[PDB]
Ligand binder design. Structure first.
Ligand SMILES: Nc1ncnc2c1ncn2[C@@H]1O[C@H](COP(=O)(O)OP(=O)(O)OP(=O)(O)O)[C@@H](O)[C@H]1O
Ligand SMILES: Nc1ncnc2c1ncn2[C@@H]1O[C@H](COP(=O)(O)OP(=O)(O)OP(=O)(O)O)[C@@H](O)[C@H]1O
Lengths: 76, 427, 445, 79
C-alpha cells in the first residue's frame, strides 16, 4: 500500500510546495509540542514520534533531488 | 412505622408535581430522620443441607459474636453463607435486578439423602423486618423451587429513593476479610481518584493501591485548600483548560479526558465547602487512627522526591520505608487503612465519619500476631468502631480468654441416632 | 580444584588428601576399567558416604536490623523464639543466601548465585557495607564462606571468598561422574508464601529438576501431582505380568489344600501335588521379587501413602480413581468420601508440606533401600500456621521421628510448642541497649 | 482391536507396547531384531500412523455388533 501511495505522488507531479507544506506542518507540530511541554507522557511520545517521522520524510524529500529512487520502477 | 411513612411519602409524591416542593416536603425529612435513627442489624440465620452442616439456626448479638472451634467444624461455612446472603442485597441496592452469587454444585452435602440446599436469613431495621431465601437443588432432580427476593428489593428501593432525593445520604457498609487478606505482598508492596465514586465493591479485598492514590489526593487537597498557597485556583484551572483547548485546536481521547479532568478541577469553586471536616482534619484523623494500633512507632509522613511519593515511618531512631516493615504491622496497617477508608468515604456528611453503620466478617483474627498483641486487639477494634457489627472467628485460647460470656459460641460434633451432627452451645 | 604433585607433609586420612590422591592417579592411567576398580576410588566413596552434612555456625554484621551477632546451631534441631520485629526471618534468609551458592555450583561450575539487595543494608549513618559468613563441617573437613555488599554511593570495593564452596562442589561432581546412582544433599526452604498454594506432558524425571530453585512455590504442587500418577501406573505394570502367574498357581495350591481339609482328608497323587506346590513356592521365594527392595513399585507407593496418612489420623485411606476425562484423588473421613478441594486449610498445608518433602527425598536418593534416611538441612518459618493447639504439641516429634538424619531449623511464635522441646536446643532472642546502641542478643535457657 | 488393526496394516513390525521405565516411559516397536521409539519415525510414517489410527477408531466405534468390525460400509475422500 505504501509503495503505491508514493507512486501516486509521482503521478501527481508534486512540486516543492508539498515539501514547504510538510515543513510548515512540522514546525506547527514542534510548536504544539513545546506548548504541551509546559503546564500526558503518551501524548508527548506520540508527538516526538510524529516529529521524527516528519524529519525522516523531509530527509527523503531532500534525497529525492539526488535522483530519488523511482518508486514507480520499484512497483513495476 | 417506617413502612407506613415510606408508603405515604411515595403516594404523596406520585400524585404531585414541582419536584422543588417534593424536596421541601416534610415527608422526605421524616423519612430521612427515620432512616438515620434506624441501625443495621442481622438478628438470625438458618442453614439447611449446606456443606457439612445439615440443619442449624443461629442468633447473633448486637455488637460482636465470635465462633471458637477446632479444625474442620464449619467455621468458614458460616461466613461464606452470610456473604452469599449479603451479596443479593448488595447487588439489588447497586443496580436494578443485578444478579448475585449462586450456590455451586459441590456446596451441597455429599450424602445421597439430601436433594437440595437452602439458606434463609432475616434482617431487622429498628422495627421493620425482612427475610430472604436462596435455594439450589442437586443435579438431575425435579421440584426446582426458586428463591425469594421480594424483601431485599423492598429494602433496596428505600435506599435508592433516599439517595435520589438527597445526594448526601449515607449507606451501610458490607465488607468481608477472608484468609486472602494475606499474600506474599501482604496487602503492601504489590490515574486519579475522580473525587468520590461510591463503591458497591465486592466484599473481598485484593488491591490496596487505591488507598495510596486516594491518600495522595487527600494530601494535595489538604495543602491547597486549608494551607492556601493557591490564589485563584479555579481561575488557574480554567486557564489551564483553555490552554489545553488551544493546544487541541493547534492521543485525541487522552487530550479530551485531560480537558474534562481540568474542568473537574476548575469545578472546585462550584464545590466550595471548606467545612469543619476539612481535608487536614481527615488527614490527621486517619494518621492518628493508624498510629493508635502501632504503639512502637512515632510519626508517619508522605515525602515527595524524584517526582514520586513515598511513605516514611519513624521507629526508635531509624526512619523506615514501607517495604521494610514486617508482616505483623503490614497486616494491621492494611486492614485498618481499608476499613477506615470505606468509613470515611461512604459517609460524607457526619461530623465524625467513623460513626456509620455496617457489618464486618473476619476469619482467623490471630494471623501473625504474638500473644501480647492478641490480648488487646478486640477491645481496640470494638472501641474504635462503636456503631458496627462484627463477626469473627478464632481458635487461639489467648483470644477467647478476654471475651465476655454472652458473646462466645462453641461448636461441637455429637452423634445422634447414629449420625454425627454439628451443634452449638454457650458456656 | 586442580592437581598437584602430592606434597608429602605428614600422614593423614583427610577427605581432601584422598581427593588429591585420586586426582594425581587419574592423570596417568588411561583405561577406565582400572580407574573404576582402583582402591583410591573406594576410599574416596567410603569417606564421602560415612560423612554427615552439618552446618556449624553463622555470623551476621550490619544486615537488616542485626548489627553484629553470632550463632551456633545444633546438628539435629534448633528453635528460635521471639516477638514481632526481632529478626526471626532475617536469619533464615541469610542461610538461604549462603546455601544458594553451593546449590548453583553443583549444576555447573563458575555460575553465580544470589546477591544482597540494595535495600537490605542497614539504614544507619555510620555503616558502609554488610557481610555474612558461614561454615560447613563434614565430620573432620571444614569449609567457610563470606558474602558481602558495599553501600550504594561509596567508592571502596569489597569481594567475595568462594574457594571453599567451589572446592567442595568439585568433590560431589567428581564422585557423581564415576558412580551410577550417587546421592546428593537436600536443601529446602519453606517460606511464609505457602499460602499461595491454595504442561507439555513431561515424560522424563531426574534428580536435577529439584535443583532449579531452593524455595518452594507454585508449580511444585503441580509437578507433585504429575509425579504421583506416574508412580501409580508403574505399580500397575508390575502388578501384571508374571506376578499374576505365581499368584494364580499358589492360589490353586491353596484351594487344593483346602480340599484336602474336606472329604474326610481323603502318597501317590497327594505326594506329587504336595511336591509340585513346594517346588513352586520355593521358586517364587527364590525369586524374592527379582529385585527385592530394588523393585520398589508397590512398596514405594504404599510408603508414600502411609507417610502422608501418618500426620492425619482421622482419615482411613487415599485412592487414585480415573475419571472419564481426568484423574481424581479420593479420601474418606469418617463415613463420607472427600475430594482434595473440599479439605480445610490446615489439612491442605500438612498435605503439601509432607508430600513435597517425601518427593524431594525419594528423588534425591535412588540407591537407598529406604530413601527417607538421607542427609540435608530444612528451614521452616512459623510452624504453627493454621494449626490448632492439639496438633501443635505433636508436630515436632513426628517430624523428627519420620526423618531422623535431617537437620532442622525452625522459627515459632507461640508457647504451646515450647512445652515439648529439650533445653539444649532453644535460643531466645532479646533486645538490649549496650554502650548507648540498641542491639539484639541470643540467650540459651 | 486398534493395535491389531495397525499391526495388520504394517506387517514389517512385530509388536508395539508402552513401557514404564525407572525414570520415564515410552512406546516401543520391534522390527526384525531392533527396538525403536515412536519418535524416531519420519514424517511419512507418522502421517500413515494417524490416518490408519483414526480410520480404525471410527470403524470400531460404528459397528459394535459385527464379529469383524472391519467389514462395514461407507465412503472416504482423500485429497
Ligand atoms: N459436601 C460435603 N459433604 C460432606 N462433608 C463436607 C462437604 N464439604 C465439606 N465437608 C467437610 O467440611 C469440613 C470442614 O470444611 P470447611 O471448609 O467448612 O472448614 P472449616 O472448619 O469451616 O474451616 P477453618 O479451619 O478455616 O475454620 C471438611 O473436613 C470436609 O470433610
Ligand atoms: N534496612 C533496615 N534498617 C533497619 N531496620 C530494618 C531494615 N530492614 C528491616 N528492618 C527491621 O526489620 C524488622 C522486621 O524484621 P523481620 O521480618 O526479620 O522480623 P519478624 O517480624 O520476626 O519476621 P517474620 O514475621 O517475617 O517471620 C522491622 O521491624 C524493621 O525495623
Amino acid at each position: 500500500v505504501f509503495l503505491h501511495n508514493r507512486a501516486s505522488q509521482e503521478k501527481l507531479s508534486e512540486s516543492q510546495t508539498t515539501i514547504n507544506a510538510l515543513f510548515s506542518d512540522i514546525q506547527s507540530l514542534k510548536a504544539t509540542l513545546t506548548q504541551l511541554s509546559a503546564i500526558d507522557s503518551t501524548v508527548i511520545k506520540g508527538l516526538e514520534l510524529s516529529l521524527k517521522e516528519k524529519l525522516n520524510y523531509m530527509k527523503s524529500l531532500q534525497s529525492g533531488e539526488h535522483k530519488f529512487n523511482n518508486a514507480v520502477s520499484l512497483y513495476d | 412505622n417506617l413502612e407506613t411513612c415510606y408508603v405515604d411519602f411515595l403516594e404523596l409524591e406520585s400524585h404531585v408535581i414541582n419536584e422543588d416542593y417534593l424536596k421541601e416536603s416534610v415527608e422526605l425529612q421524616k423519612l430521612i430522620s427515620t432512616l438515620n435513627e434506624s441501625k443495621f442489624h442481622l438478628n438470625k440465620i438458618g442453614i439447611h443441607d449446606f456443606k457439612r452442616i445439615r440443619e442449624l439456626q443461629i442468633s447473633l448479638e448486637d455488637d460482636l459474636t465470635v465462633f471458637v472451634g477446632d479444625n474442620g467444624f464449619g467455621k468458614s461455612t458460616i461466613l461464606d453463607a452470610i456473604a452469599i446472603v449479603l451479596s443479593w442485597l448488595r447487588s439489588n441496592i447497586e443496580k436494578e435486578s443485578k444478579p448475585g452469587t449462586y450456590i455451586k454444585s459441590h456446596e451441597v452435602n455429599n450424602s445421597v439423602d439430601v436433594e437440595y440446599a437452602s439458606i434463609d436469613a432475616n434482617i431487622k431495621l429498628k422495627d421493620f423486618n425482612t427475610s430472604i431465601l436462596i435455594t439450589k437443588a442437586k443435579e438431575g432432580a425435579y421440584y426446582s423451587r426458586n428463591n425469594e427476593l421480594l424483601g431485599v428489593k423492598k429494602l433496596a428501593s428505600i435506599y435508592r429513593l433516599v439517595n435520589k432525593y438527597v445526594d448526601n445520604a449515607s449507606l451501610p457498609l458490607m465488607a468481608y476479610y477472608s484468609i486472602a487478606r494475606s499474600y506474599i505482598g501482604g496487602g503492601v508492596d504489590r490515574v486519579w481518584s475522580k473525587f468520590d465514586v461510591y463503591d458497591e465493591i465486592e466484599f473481598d479485598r485484593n488491591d490496596f493501591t487505591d488507598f495510596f492514590q486516594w491518600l495522595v489526593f487527600l494530601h494535595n487537597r489538604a495543602s491547597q485548600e486549608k494551607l492556601s498557597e493557591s490564589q485563584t485556583t479555579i481561575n488557574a484551572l480554567f486557564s489551564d483548560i483553555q490552554s489545553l483547548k488551544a493546544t487541541l485546536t493547534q492521543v485525541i481521547k487522552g487530550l479530551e479526558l485531560s480537558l474534562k479532568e481540568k474542568l473537574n478541577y476548575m469545578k472546585s469553586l462550584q464545590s466550595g465547602e471548606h467545612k469543619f471536616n476539612n481535608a487536614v482534619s481527615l488527614y490527621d484523623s486517619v494518621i492518628n487512627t493508624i498510629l493508635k494500633f502501632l504503639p512502637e512507632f512515632q510519626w508517619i509522613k508522605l515525602v515527595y522526591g524524584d517526582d514520586d511519593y513515598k511513605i516514611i515511618l519513624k521507629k526508635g531512631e531509624v526512619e523506615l520505608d514501607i517495604q521494610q516493615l514486617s508482616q505483623g504491622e503490614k497486616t494491621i496497617f492494611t486492614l485498618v487503612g481499608d476499613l477506615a477508608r470505606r468509613l470515611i468515604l461512604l459517609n460524607p456528611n457526619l461530623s465524625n465519619p467513623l460513626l456509620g453503620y455496617g457489618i464486618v466478617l473476619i476469619d482467623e483474627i490471630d494471623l501473625h500476631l504474638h500473644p501480647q498483641w492478641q490480648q488487646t486487639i478486640i477491645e481496640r477494634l470494638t472501641s474504635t468502631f462503636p456503631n458496627v457489627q462484627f463477626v469473627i472467628t478464632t481458635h487461639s485460647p489467648q483470644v477467647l480468654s478476654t471475651v465476655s460470656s454472652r458473646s462466645v459460641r462453641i461448636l461441637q460434633e455429637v452423634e445422634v441416632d447414629g449420625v454425627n451432627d454439628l451443634i452449638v452451645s454457650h458456656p
